[PDB]
Amino acid sequence: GAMGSKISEQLKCCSGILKEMFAKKHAAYAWPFYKPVDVEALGLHDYCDIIKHPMDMSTIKSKLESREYRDAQEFGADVRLMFSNCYKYNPPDHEVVAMARKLQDVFEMRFAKMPD
């Protein structure tokens, strides 16, 4: 070999995108998405009445590491879900929604380059 691991090229792309999303360059807008929403700490007593399936970047990282995602579509669905939860829960004028849109742009422009 050869350099790599045995994961597909697509899944390498997914892991590279997620690493970029965690990079310092994006941290000023990415940080809300790093970890599960801390509903106790933020007093979000309605969160779990609104959001059925919480998602966050650390969970996504763990699911790449465990090889749970079988393909790029499955990974992209979790990234989507994270942003959609933000858009569903928060008022449309909230700062976090603006941060989500910025991180989502980072994600979508690069995910669009997925190999095929």
Q: Where are the domains of the chain?
A: 1-116
Whether 103 and 30 have beta carbons less than 8 Å apart is answered as yes
| Alpha carbon distance 102, 23 (integer Å) | 14
Q: What is the spatial distance between Cα 80 and Cα 90, in angstroms, rounded to a whole number?
A: 16
Find the angle CA(112)-CA(113)-CA(116) to the nearest 5 degrees.
Answer: 105
Task: With beta carbons less than 8 A apart as the criterion, state whether 92 and 57 touch.
Answer: no
The structure was resolved to a resolution in Å of 1.2
Class of domain 1-116: mainly alpha
Q: How far is CA 11 from CA 39, 46, 71, in A?
A: 31, 35, 6
Q: Amino acid identity of 23? A: A
CB neighbours (10 Å) of residue 62?
Answer: 11
Residues 48, 19: Cα–Cα separation, whole Å: 28
Q: Cβ distance 100 to 83 under 8 Å?
A: yes
Rg, the chain, Cα only: 15
